[PDB]
Amino acid sequence: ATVSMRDMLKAGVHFGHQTRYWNPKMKPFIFGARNKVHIINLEKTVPMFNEALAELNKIASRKGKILFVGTKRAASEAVKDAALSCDQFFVNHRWLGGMLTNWKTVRQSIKRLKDLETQSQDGTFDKLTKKEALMRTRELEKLENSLGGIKDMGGLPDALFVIDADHEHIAIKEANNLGIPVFAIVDTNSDPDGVDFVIPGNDDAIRAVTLYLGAVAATVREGRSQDLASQAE
């Protein structure tokens, strides 16, 4: 969990946005301006990232629920696979508004969702109508899109790992209102004050995003190793 200060360099972590869209709070992590862009200071970046990795690793050891948030369509697919690979569930695209707080109200929603899935191999064959059938399938699709990937939790998650943060400012606000710790790949235009582990990367190119996903994925497997057995053969 000490990704070479050079691997990210080729990934694209150094290229932020332009000044026209630059969070002034991010000054501590600036190196200059290539073609009026803002090159994140990787040397400043890297200790924080590795530190959060360790933090997140001890979490998974205590068996604290982790979570990830979907972003752009490419990001969402990548997040899903990495999450499904181990555990820790995952959001997809919308964050379903006030999921946190209204977690009890969306719990009833999850209940109805699972029933429909179960009754999707039951109610479909019997009493099928050219009208009701389309109803069932379509609603399930919509529900699945976002609610799917969270239905497993069956309770309040104990951590969150979002990306960019700005695109999901709503998610961070609710998490701050409960104590649930979070991690965010803040970029040159993202308010990091609400984050407890500022990862000053770049939510872009996917390439670099895939690096962050791969990294954390590895740390949570170390947590599972403490939950299963040590390395040997």
Partner: peptide, 9 residues
């Protein structure tokens, strides 16, 4: 890609 020396500077 930019040289490591300039990047580290």
């Amino acid at each position: 890609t930019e040289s490591f020396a300039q990047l580290f500077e």
